[PDB]
Amino acid sequence: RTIGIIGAPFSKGQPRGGVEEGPTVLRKAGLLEKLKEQECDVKDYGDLPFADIPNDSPFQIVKNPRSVGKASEQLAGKVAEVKKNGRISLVLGGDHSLAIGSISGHARVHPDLGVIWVDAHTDINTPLTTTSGNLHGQPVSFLLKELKGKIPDVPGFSWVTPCISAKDIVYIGLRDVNPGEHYILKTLGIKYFSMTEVDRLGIGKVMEETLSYLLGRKKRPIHLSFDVDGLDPSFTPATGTPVVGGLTYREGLYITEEIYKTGLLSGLDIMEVNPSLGKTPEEVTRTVNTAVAITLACFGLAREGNHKPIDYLN
Amino acid sequence: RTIGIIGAPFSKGQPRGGVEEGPTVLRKAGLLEKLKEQECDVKDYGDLPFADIPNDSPFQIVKNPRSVGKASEQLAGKVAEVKKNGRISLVLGGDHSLAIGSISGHARVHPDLGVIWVDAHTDINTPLTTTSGNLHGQPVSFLLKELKGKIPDVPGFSWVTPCISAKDIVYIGLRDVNPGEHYILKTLGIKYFSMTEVDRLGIGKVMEETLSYLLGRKKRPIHLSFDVDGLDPSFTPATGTPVVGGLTYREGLYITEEIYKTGLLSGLDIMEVNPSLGKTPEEVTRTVNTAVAITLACFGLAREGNHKPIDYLN
Amino acid sequence: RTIGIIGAPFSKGQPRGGVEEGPTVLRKAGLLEKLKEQECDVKDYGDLPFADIPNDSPFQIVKNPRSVGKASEQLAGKVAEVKKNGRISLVLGGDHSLAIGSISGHARVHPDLGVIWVDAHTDINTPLTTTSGNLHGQPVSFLLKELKGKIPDVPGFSWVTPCISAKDIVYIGLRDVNPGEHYILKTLGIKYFSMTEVDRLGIGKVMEETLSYLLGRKKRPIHLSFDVDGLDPSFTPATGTPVVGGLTYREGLYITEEIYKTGLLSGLDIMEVNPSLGKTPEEVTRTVNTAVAITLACFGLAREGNHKPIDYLN
Ligand SMILES: N[C@@H](CCCC[B-](O)(O)O)C(=O)O
Ligand SMILES: N[C@@H](CCCC[B-](O)(O)O)C(=O)O
Numbered sequence A, B, C: 001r002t003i004g005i006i007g008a009p010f011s012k013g014q015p016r017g018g019v020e021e022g023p024t025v026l027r028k029a030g031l032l033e034k035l036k037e038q039e040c041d042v043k044d045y046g047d048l049p050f051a052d053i054p055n056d057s058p059f060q061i062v063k064n065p066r067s068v069g070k071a072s073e074q075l076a077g078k079v080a081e082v083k084k085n086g087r088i089s090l091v092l093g094g095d096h097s098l099a100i101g102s103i104s105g106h107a108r109v110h111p112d113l114g115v116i117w118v119d120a121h122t123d124i125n126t127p128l129t130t131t132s133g134n135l136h137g138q139p140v141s142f143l144l145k146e147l148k149g150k151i152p153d154v155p156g157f158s159w160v161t162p163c164i165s166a167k168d169i170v171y172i173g174l175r176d177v178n179p180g181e182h183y184i185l186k187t188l189g190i191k192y193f194s195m196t197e198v199d200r201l202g203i204g205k206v207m208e209e210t211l212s213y214l215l216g217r218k219k220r221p222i223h224l225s226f227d228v229d230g231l232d233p234s235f236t237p238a239t240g241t242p243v244v245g246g247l248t249y250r251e252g253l254y255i256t257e258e259i260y261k262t263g264l265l266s267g268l269d270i271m272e273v274n275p276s277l278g279k280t281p282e283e284v285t286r287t288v289n290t291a292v293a294i295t296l297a298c299f300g301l302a303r304e305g306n307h308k309p310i311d312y313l314n
């Protein structure tokens, strides 16, 4: 596949800053090198230089609003620039608030995209239902058209125009959903497969329904926003909000392998990797390695094996 | 749901005494507080004061018979008292021998109850087939009507009257069944889903069949006797008889979530939690936390989220 | 069942020598004693005394060819001798290169056998596609009739005559397949269930298809070549080539339990156990214990329980 790597070292969508070390540790793990080792065409668009906004007081309870709204504004333009180049944007990020810009810029070039959200959380809190005030747990609320008229005018986000409908998104891996968020889920009819549905149906069936749900009417570009805490912390411990009983390594790879096989993947997000939170150097390596594996699976690496179109027996 | 918490700090159903610290550590973990945080009506019936029986020599091979038969005699009356109050009895116990009193007192008020037994073992040894002599591995033998005429007159249990038929009980999670016990299983036609059936069908199907098996003829009150060693020791290490290859955290929560959803749960047992056996303080916290999670799932906590009947967008 | 234990302490099929300690640690774990504790008829054929071949330079890239071809030549005759005795050969080995002799000797007495290969790898590299030069990752290439005319004349293997067709073998657990190997897989139409198919179908379905695939036309003797790295390294860490995201303990036991139940098992291989690679003594015990469990499952030990044909209630 043909990639367009974008490093997004941002963390003001939440409290812990070590998250902006993601683009760095993932690249050192050899991500670019490994993609090239596959049938991949890769162009590194560099790490976006996010400028600090000293004067950025809370909007009510919402923290670092201008800083966050700016980082997504900047990211949105990069993602659109890479999608204009006929490449699949790979946003190596910090916190999940960057999804607002990622999905926004992608939808500018492909308004009919579908979103698959792998995460332990729904991240659909509005500035008024949030209790933490952290914008990384509110990205979907800014993107959903149906919630337009319920999101206040928060400093830094005037440029935002909801681009996805409640019916063009699927959640996979949920296990820590706030009360208001759940109300949103059932009220707007959002499709999701929490860990309970995964336990009941199996990831094989969960992926069949997910893909049918989004591509059954007609094929459309796929945006995969992957929060590494969607996977169990025994796989990705170095993340800010781990929740036990998560998706397995195998399930993580199954999800992505199936997405790749659709040939419809066009936008990907690898988020919330925070090395600074690894209890040990191995926990850091375990988290980074899992993130790389999931990434490579999105672009072709198959557990059954891969081979070029040639005669190996010669 | 409406609870009736009963602390049962008893351990003479087996060798290790640290098991009577269960009611204590579970309460300190905030169990009562967490239930109230949910749509739960809770009444703490206190910890039953089990009096020591100094003169209690073995009945043949059976150990602490009078002490065990008395603790279940006492528990049975409490469980019936709470069921008379129109509440779901939550027996926070020590060893599983207390199930004899738990199921007995529950059946006094609801003779038509069905039992779901989550455990690594069948606990169906009779005083004559047991090899350890520990009564916590014999509770079902005292309750099954079909085995009446095969259980000797053991000091301390004259008050017992078998209350459940071999066909009103389902086992989930089996992986360490004694030879005599297995003979009992196949001979009395007891329905069970060992770890092999779980591997074959998946916990989703296992729960569908379990619930159909017990409620298909007609709806009837459900008694869930949960031995924490039913789950793999990587989740509940602090328990006296761990067996590898157990139910996962997710499967544990799936089982209970499905039980709750039946609206038929009326009696629950959380057994065999022994803090004193945790290799480290974290193993203790891991065991206690898992037990609390399983408990909350029995009363409504859903992994997909929970919300009150109000308008959150306001 | 009736066993014929053969110890094969060989390791020249790969770099690390600690692998020849397998027959020793497995026996000390009480394997023979445990089999006898079951309805098993066991005869220990001893540990094959592999003589060192000082003069054994590489054949091109292939290492220790004469040493490896000799060890399998010797093993093949033992396996045939045990199969002549109407016993199920249990080859406790070193590295997987010994499979060439194991399957070869078994097929001499039962030409119509079927092979089930549990492994993280396909071990189907030819002397020309291999990149490591280690013969333990090439055993199947020597056995497949279809690849005859593609395997060079390697010193030590002239005695070999391919005995199995590409259609009489099934792979379970694959997750690290080389490019040439994959080309072989798809070209010869080899049936396999990588970790992706296991994730999709579940081990229950995977075993149903595996067994139907091999025994549907007609019942035929089963040869199970089990590489302990087929299971996840959280279960069998002490092995030379671990790959994350492997089969679970439960899945491992399910596979074997189902094989046993066919009553068709006639040859088994327990390979790649290397104690010297255990980070700690517990990792060694974890690996050894898992290997023993898998072995006992092949011969009857059932997780639901086992009982003799007698009346236990008496
Ligand atoms: N729901 C919590 C947790 C947020 C988790 C955000 B995430 O998924 O991006 O890590 C909050 O609203 O603050
Ligand atoms: N079957 C063994 C083990 C007993 C386990 C009892 B339990 O499940 O309550 O922990 C015995 O009869 O002693």
Ligand SMILES: N[C@@H](CCCC[B-](O)(O)O)C(=O)O
Residues within 6 Å of the ligand: C095, C096, C097, C119, C120, C121, C123, C125, C130, C131, C132, C133, C134, C136, C137, C138, C178, C227, C229, C241, C272
């Ligand atoms: N495919 C690699 C790894 C070999 C693994 C061999 B085995 O499965 O027997 O441990 C090689 O050809 O050298």
Ligand SMILES: [Mn+2]
Residues within 6 Å of the ligand: A096, A119, A121, A123, A136, A227
């Ligand atoms: Mn998120």
Ligand SMILES: [Mn+2]
Residues within 6 Å of the ligand: A119, A120, A121, A227, A229, A230, A241
């Ligand atoms: Mn999250």
Ligand SMILES: [Mn+2]
Residues within 6 Å of the ligand: B096, B119, B121, B123, B136, B227
């Ligand atoms: Mn029990």
Ligand SMILES: [Mn+2]
Residues within 6 Å of the ligand: B119, B120, B121, B227, B229, B230, B241
């Ligand atoms: Mn038990």
Ligand SMILES: [Mn+2]
Residues within 6 Å of the ligand: C096, C119, C121, C123, C136, C227
């Ligand atoms: Mn192998």
Ligand SMILES: [Mn+2]
Residues within 6 Å of the ligand: C119, C120, C121, C227, C229, C230, C241
């Ligand atoms: Mn292998």
